[PDB]
Amino acid sequence: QIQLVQSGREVKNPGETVKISCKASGYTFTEYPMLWVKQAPGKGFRWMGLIYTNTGEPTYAEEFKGRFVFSLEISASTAYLQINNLTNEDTATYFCVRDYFISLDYWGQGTTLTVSSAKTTAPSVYPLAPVCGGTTGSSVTLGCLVKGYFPEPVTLTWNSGSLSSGVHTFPALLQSGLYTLSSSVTVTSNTWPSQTITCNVAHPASSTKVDKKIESRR
Amino acid sequence: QAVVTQESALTTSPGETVTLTCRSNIGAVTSSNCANWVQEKPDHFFTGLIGDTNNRRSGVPARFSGSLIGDKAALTITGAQTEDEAIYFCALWYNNLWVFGGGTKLTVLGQPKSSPSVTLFPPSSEELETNKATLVCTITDFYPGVVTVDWKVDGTPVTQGMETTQPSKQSNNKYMASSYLTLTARAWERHSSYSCQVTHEGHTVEKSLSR
Amino acid sequence: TIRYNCTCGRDNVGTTSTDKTINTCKIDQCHAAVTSHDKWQFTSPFVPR
């Protein structure tokens, strides 16, 4: 029952290398040869290889002969996909999986790959909270944008750990030479304007970490 | 090598479910080729409901069936509801491992469209004291697939520098995004008439600035 | 005839023209060879029994 407890969208140089992990949690990858494959983003998954259970070495895909490489973080029966020859066309998804019945029986996470140049900065907090007039109903409007993830991204949830539901955090967007990672939320009006959710955007690949509380619009 | 010469889409509906007869571009169907239907959603992860040509999947309701069907792999999103449809990768693992083929996008009855949950706040004051303005009309929890942006630039709809949020499968289960109507400090400072018009499903609605 | 071997499960140790299951053991934690009968193999050098 493999869940690839892995990383997300790692970023690289042109030609350079980086290892995106997937330690196998949920099922027994210590005897499980489980897929740690790439992701051609238009079609979906990418056959980049499986990782044998006992020894920890992969078998590598034919199109994965190239970027993806095998390693075995086998402390829960897991691995890691190495990245060599960081491409101009290598920007794309990645996945893990582990099961029996020679198809992989469960499909874990993986993460995206940003093989491209960027700036030296992350997205930074600008709040879109309820106004000096209104910002109150049954609830008010709240949200944020960590703008300027270059090299990105910033992940933005609402209430920053003390709240997870109710923050509709949108994806980082590619505009102005940055990633814009932020969101909206039906924020509290019977909670606010006293008590708010400290909506946070976190991205240490550019060194941004901005949480905005229940802040006044005026 | 092979192909899943079949439904690269599926046709599932309320009262039923769609069984993609992903016909053989590899050969006949079989459980040894492991022609499966790995279901997926927004959040993009393929997950197993029917696989190995006779096996069910764990966490699956009665919405699935995995075999060789027609003259190929047969992937049934069969029992499509609001929890019973998905986009499935076409499981091909001929004693090696189940990788993607064509994969059938089986539907299900559900997801009623209802107008975009617009959250209306102004842009940042340090955005205004830093020579910008991006006044946030966010359309979250929205239905159907219809987003209306009325970037009231100079008061009337003008597209001088405005910015949209991103479409995503969010916690509303549906369409959602932000939108900062875009003015400068003085470019959106001499005019404080900024407009964000949020439109759900062919219907428009207006929001003007405060301050 | 199968001539299996146990790594994860001794049902991986399999003699059979009859199939079974292994869980959590491929090559690397299984064993399989071709161990059958119907032949008195007289003079097999260079491939030991």
As a whole number of Å, the end-to-end CA separation of chain C is: 14
- Chain B residues 57-76 with a CB less than 8 Å from chain A: 57-58
The two tokens of residue B201 are 């499903």
Whether cis (ω within 30° of 0) applies to the bond prior to A151 is yes
Residue B112 and residue B201: Cα distance in Å, rounded?
11
- Is residue B84 within 8 A of residue B17, CB to CB? The reply is yes
Distance, in Å, from the CA atom of B64 to the CA atom of B17, rounded to the nearest integer, reads 8
How far A110 CA sits from the closest chain C CA (Å)? 22
3-state secondary structure of B5: coil
Q: CA A50, CA A96: separation in Å to the nearest integer?
A: 9
What's the rounded Cα separation, in Å, for the pair A141 and B69? 50
Resolution, in Å, please? Answer: 6.3
Alpha helices for chain B (secondary structure H): 125-128
Largest separation between any pair of C-alpha atoms in chain C: 39
Experimental method: cryo-EM
Give the closest residue to A199 by CA, choosing from A155, A143, A154.
A143
**Cβ–Cβ below 8 Å for A145 and B168:** no
User: Which residues touch C46 (CB under 8 Å, ≥6 apart)?
Assistant: none
CA distance A83 to chain C (A): 26
Helix (H, G, I), strand (E, B) or coil at B172: coil
Could you give the CA distance from residue B16 to residue A112 in angstroms, rounded to a whole number? Answer: 35
H or E segment at A71? strand A68-71
Chains B and C touch (3+ CB pairs under 8 A): no
Subunit contact B48:A107, Cβ cutoff 8 A = yes
**Which token pair is B76?**
């049934």
Cβ distance of A54 and C29 shorter than 8 Å = yes
Size of interface A-B (CB pairs under 8 A): 166
CA distance B3 to B26: 6
- Among B50, B166, B176, pick the best mutation site for testing chain A contact (most A Cβ within 10 A): B166
What are A13's two structure tokens? 């140089």
Radius of gyration in angstroms for the set of CA atoms belonging to chain B, rounded to a whole number: 23
Q: Are residues B65 and B19 in contact, defined by beta-carbon separation less than 8 angstroms?
A: yes
Of B55, B119, B210, the CB nearest to A143: B119
Which tokens sit at A163? 């709240």
What phi and psi values does residue A119 have, to the nearest 5 degrees? -90, -165
Answer for the pair A96, A110: CB distance below 8 angstroms, yes or no.
Answer: yes
**Cα A36 from chain centroid (whole Å):** 16
From chain C, the residues in CB contact with A53 under 8 A are 24-26, 28-29
Contact of B192 with chain A, judged by CB distance below 8 Å, is answered with no
In terms of C-beta density within 10 A (0-12 exposed, 13-18 middle, 19 or more buried), how is residue A81 classed? buried
Q: Are A111 and A20 in contact (CB under 8 A)?
A: yes
Bridge partners for A71 per DSSP? A80
For residue B203, give both structure tokens. 């219907």
Three-class SS state of A211 = strand
Q: Are B171 and B190 in contact (CB under 8 A)?
A: no
Sequence-distant (6+) residues with CB within 8 A of C40 are none
Question: What three-state secondary structure class fits A86?
Answer: coil
CB-based contact B121 A106, cutoff 8 Å: no
d(CA A70, CA A52) in angstroms, rounded, equals: 10
How close C1 comes to chain A (CA, Å)?
22
Lookup result for tokens 């469209």: B113
Q: For tokens 């023209």, what's the residue? A: C17
Cis peptide before A153 (omega within 30 of 0): yes
Neighbouring-strand partners of residue A139: A188
Residue of chain A whose alpha carbon sits nearest to that of B119: A141
Residue in C21, C26, C30 to test binding to A, most A beta-carbons within 10 Å: C26
Q: Which residues of A touch B55 (CB under 8 A)?
A: 101, 105
Beta-sheet pairing, B99-100 with B89-92? antiparallel
Q: Do C26 and A30 lie within an 8 Å CB cutoff?
A: no
